[PDB]
Design a protein around this ligand. Structure first.
Ligand SMILES: *[C@@H]1O[C@H](CO)[C@@H](O[C@H]2O[C@H](CO)[C@@H](O)[C@H](O)[C@H]2NC(C)=O)[C@H](O)[C@H]1NC(C)=O
Ligand SMILES: *[C@@H]1O[C@H](CO)[C@@H](O)[C@H](O)[C@H]1NC(C)=O
Ligand SMILES: *[C@@H]1O[C@H](CO)[C@@H](O)[C@H](O)[C@H]1NC(C)=O
Ligand SMILES: *[C@@H]1O[C@H](CO)[C@@H](O)[C@H](O)[C@H]1NC(C)=O
Length: 517
């Protein structure tokens, strides 16, 4: 397949055609990273929801595979859709689905029932009901068999929340080493509350605790996750819940986004750290401060220092209307997950997790240093559509802002600004004049994330640009900002801008990135 379309990210996953949303079933197994995803095999917007499937050895060079869970009745009257979920390698065959070949992979997902019906298990379900079901694969995830005999395995939300049967979804299951139990985290979406269950066999589930609400509650809670992360450089660890909400995303955005909580987990209860929850219902820990980072899900099958989340690089506010063809939506750059103590606070730090050395030119197309960069904008350079920018500069600068203007027309009336506001100590991304902004009135906006300078007073930004995206990693990765852009064919120019004064100790480098397709 030829992936050379305008706006087609060359180092972000997207399906060859049709609509994609949430990443699902993230599992590393026998050297392969599986990426399943909410997928419409019959259209360019949300519908006929199925689990699509792609694989890579390196989180970088993806190969699209056959649909893994195809909406039941697809092409006819659809009776079951496969909403979001997760997957594990049941290597000891606790499920009993293994035969005389490979031990099974097991997917746990939300069954959505568009119509009232009686299922092969004998259970009766209502119109628009959401329940938790499982499927298994004996060919390393290529094909899947749904557990018809007993699905759904968690039919109902916990008492007293039975009324929430239409909004009970997104199971994240994992093997908990410490308690030797399968643990699943689900969302009672409208109540902003997670329900946690345990199992010895992936089929029979017991409710063990509930978490939340805390912090951001301005939208339905979705896509919960729970992972143990290393803290700093020693043997300390903490558990982290990631969860999305829609709408009620980060400050300065309209629509969906991703928050997190740092704490501890004993096999049944997640206890938030005292400093991770804030009085009231607005202030939150944001995984990403931009508009386009949602349904962030973690990989199963990875070790302590190797954890990776993948996010959907779109926003429910306008996602249906982004000007892409013949596909719609991409995943963000995979995010390596860790914690660092920053300003006396355990803080999520992300690293851009791709095989950069396999696709990045070693010689920068642009490389300059300035003891003092003059107020104004520098000479123009040409970058193409796919590149990385490294910037570092002094927080003590007299300028009001320092930024790179990128994906710009030659006269810079079309451009995306990525920079730092010195007084506010914030990263900003201004996509107000970034190209096509016609499809939603909220798209043409400026976004902000907090970034305190390091101990040496240096501010560092790493910026990844692809055909329709910009991702900023600030500092060590403690602040990320992810935003789509839709620039014209000529929008391949860049320059530096020091506004309102000079910028001190500037270092700037740009490297071209090749296609992964
Ligand atoms: C769900 O998939 C079906 C196909 O199974 C889509 O139905 C139509 O798709 C085309 C419109 O783009 C038509 O040309 C087809 O004739 C028609 N196909 C059938 C069999 O009905 C449908 O649009 C999909 N739903 C969504 C929301 O995208
Ligand atoms: C499989 O069995 C071994 C030995 O009991 C154990 O270490 C491991 O945790 C089990 N489960 C998985 C998922 O590997
Ligand atoms: C800007 O760069 C171009 C291309 O390298 C060069 O020709 C031109 O002289 C430069 N302009 C100034 C004023 O430095
Ligand atoms: C900038 O250039 C574009 C063509 O790339 C042109 O359409 C537009 O008029 C220019 N704007 C100004 C103010 O010169």
């Amino acid at each position: 397949f030829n992936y050379d379309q305008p706006y087609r990210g060359q180092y972000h996953f997207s399906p060859q055609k049709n609509w994609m949303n949430d990443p699902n079933g993230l599992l590393y197994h026998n050297g392969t990273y599986h990426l399943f995803f909410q997928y419409n095999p019959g259209g360019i917007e949300w519908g006929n929801i199925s689990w699509g499937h792609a694989i890579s050895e390196d989180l970088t060079h993806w190969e699209e595979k056959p649909v893994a869970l195809l909406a039941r009745g697809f092409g006819s009257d659809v009776t079951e859709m496969y909403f979001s979920g997760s997957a594990v390698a049941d290597v000891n065959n606790t499920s009993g689905f293994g035969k005389d070949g490979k031990t099974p992979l097991v997917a746990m997902y939300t069954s959505y029932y568009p119509v009232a019906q009686t299922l092969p298990s004998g259970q009766t379900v209502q119109e628009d009901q959401q329940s938790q079901s499982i499927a298994y694969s004996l060919d390393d995830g290529l094909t899947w068999t749904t557990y018809d005999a007993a699905n759904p395995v968690i039919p109902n939300p916990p008492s007293p929340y039975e009324a929430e049967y239409q909004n009970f979804r997104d199971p994240f299951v994992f093997w908990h080493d410490e308690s030797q139990k399968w643990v699943v985290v689900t969302s009672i979406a409208e109540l902003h509350k997670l329900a946690i269950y345990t199992s010895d066999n992936l089929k029979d589930w017991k409710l063990v605790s509930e978490f939340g609400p805390y912090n951001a509650q301005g939208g339905v809670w979705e896509c919960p996750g729970l992972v143990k992360l290393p803290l700093d450089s020693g043997n300390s660890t903490k558990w982290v819940i990631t969860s999305g909400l829609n709408p009620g995303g980060p400050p300065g955005t309209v629509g969906s986004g991703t928050q997190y909580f740092v704490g501890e987990f004993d096999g049944t209860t997640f206890t938030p750290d005292a400093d991770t929850v804030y009085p009231g219902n607005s202030t939150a820990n944001w995984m990403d401060w931009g508009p386009d980072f949602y349904a962030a899900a973690g990989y199963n099958g990875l070790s302590l220092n190797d954890h990776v989340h993948i996010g959907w690089m779109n926003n429910w506010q306008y996602g249906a209307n982004i000007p892409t063809y013949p596909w719609r939506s991409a995943m963000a750059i995979p995010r390596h997950m860790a914690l660092k103590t920053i300003g006396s606070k355990a803080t999520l730090v992300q690293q851009p997790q791709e095989a950069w050395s396999s696709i990045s030119n070693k010689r920068p197309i642009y490389s300059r240093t300035f003891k003092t960069l003059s107020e104004g904008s520098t000479n123009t350079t040409t970058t193409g559509e796919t590149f990385k920018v490294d910037l570092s500069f002094s927080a003590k600068s007299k300028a009001s802002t320092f930024a790179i203007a990128l994906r710009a027309s030659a006269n810079f009336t079309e451009q995306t600004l990525v920079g730092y506001d010195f007084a506010k100590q914030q990263i900003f991304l201004d996509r107000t004049h970034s190209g096509d902004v016609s499809f939603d009135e909220t798209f043409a906006s400026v976004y902000h994330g907090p970034l305190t300078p390091d101990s040496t007073g240096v501010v560092k930004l790493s910026i990844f640009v692809d055909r329709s995206s910009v991702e900023v990693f600030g500092g060590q990765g403690e602040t990320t900002l992810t935003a789509q852009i839709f620039p014209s064919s000529d929008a391949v120019h860049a320059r530096l801008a020091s506004t309102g004064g000079t910028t001190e100790d500037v270092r700037a480098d740009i490297y071209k990135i090749a296609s992964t397709w």
